[PDB]
Amino acid sequence: SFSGYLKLTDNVYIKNADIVEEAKKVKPTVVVNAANVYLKHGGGVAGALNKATNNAMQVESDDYIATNGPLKVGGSCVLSGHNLAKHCLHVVGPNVNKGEDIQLLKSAYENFNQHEVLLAPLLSAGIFGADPIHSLRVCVDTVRTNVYLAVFDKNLYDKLVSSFL
Ligand SMILES: c1ncc2c(n1)NCC2
């Protein structure tokens, strides 16, 4: 089970941890991937989760895209969690670096409400370019199910906790 998390609200928890390492340890029912519409897991959380699956996540994702086409920004799909989780919920937050509507971040977090408990990163944070403090605020104000947030960067984790309202 999840350990060492700081409780932020009734249902949101946070820990300074590598989501890949957290997933291998806990083997949650759902690990959230910070996906793009093409499910091209090149970098950030997606690249790290995919590399941990020995590229099996990318092979499965390419078959999903070949069949279904790309996801919408703000959308998601449930695929296998491979050696990391029972399932991976690939969620597409807006990539601010690609000029995408930051208002789609709430729509992206709404996908989490379809799962009772999730291990997740902050959507649109990191290489997606959004303000992680804003992402945490949207997470707490949108997600009603139990979300265990893994924040890789210690300095960002401290900033998120110390500024949390
Ligand atoms: C949480 N947030 C970001 C990352 C992570 N976990 N693993 C590597 C990049």
Swiss-Prot record:
Membrane topology listed for this record: Multi-pass membrane protein
The Macro domain, residue ranges: 1-165
Catalytic activity: Thiol-dependent hydrolysis of ester, thioester, amide, peptide and isopeptide bonds formed by the C-terminal Gly of ubiquitin (a 76-residue protein attached to proteins as an intracellular targeting signal)
Activation/inhibition comment: Inhibited in vitro by GRL-0617.
Top-level division of the source organism's lineage: Viruses
Localisation: Host endoplasmic reticulum membrane
Protein role: Responsible for the cleavages located at the N-terminus of the replicase polyprotein. Participates together with nsp4 in the assembly of virally-induced cytoplasmic double-membrane vesicles necessary for viral replication. Antagonizes innate immune induction of type I interferon by blocking the phosphorylation, dimerization and subsequent nuclear translocation of host IRF3. Also prevents host NF-kappa-B signaling. In addition, PL-PRO possesses a deubiquitinating/deISGylating activity and processes both 'Lys-48'- and 'Lys-63'-linked polyubiquitin chains from cellular substrates.
Assembly behavior: May form homohexamers. Interacts with N protein.
Protein name: Papain-like protease nsp3
Species in which this protein is naturally found: Severe acute respiratory syndrome coronavirus 2 (2019-nCoV)
Organism placement in taxonomy: Viruses, Riboviria, Orthornavirae, Pisuviricota, Pisoniviricetes
